[PDB]
Amino acid sequence: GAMGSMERASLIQKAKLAEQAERYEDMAAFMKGAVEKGEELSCEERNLLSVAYKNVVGGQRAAWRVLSSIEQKSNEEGSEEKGPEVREYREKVETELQGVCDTVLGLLDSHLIKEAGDAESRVFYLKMKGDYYRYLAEVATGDDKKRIIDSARSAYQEAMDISKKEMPPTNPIRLGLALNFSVFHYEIANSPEEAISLAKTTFDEAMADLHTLSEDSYKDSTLIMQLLRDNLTLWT
């Protein structure tokens, strides 16, 4: 693509600059370029990839929710007809969101996941796959909605299976995967009890392993544990 002529190292350098400038669309385009060089990503590089796309899609999701709410209000009894514009613009934002998700899922399928053999990398990528199918699910209404939901579930489940076998219960990737899969259960799969059980069990297994950790690892793990607690508080 447009980044094909730029050195891998320069792309990664620029991604870091873009992050400092809060230019997340640029960050994402640089990281896509870096992935397309065909070499595996380091841990630092995986973090850059994830941050970039999280921020881009996060902004799209927030906009889509604003628009969807306006659209919903327009279809209530007593709302005066304002024409097709709200639906059209929601559709526009939705199509852009779907495109970003398809781009991320594309990078994971070609060929990040298949080349990832270490547990941390494979879990990280499979968690990402779950996440971007979950964003597709949030906006899905068609014949494929159940398959999209099941694609997220399958990715998250594979990641969970690997994480439980290969990583300690305090590992931040394991914790983050569990946090997100729990949100999937609550928000997407209509399974709040599964969501709660997962968050609680994850929190408690992590708590029991904190004693093994350095101060720096403890900080990393407890940050995500607090997110689990925050969700549990919201849900109970």
């Binding site: 946090l179 995500i224 919201l234």
Partner: peptide
């Protein structure tokens, strides 16, 4: 909206 990472 619930927390995710």
């Amino acid at each position: 909206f619930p927390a995710t990472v």
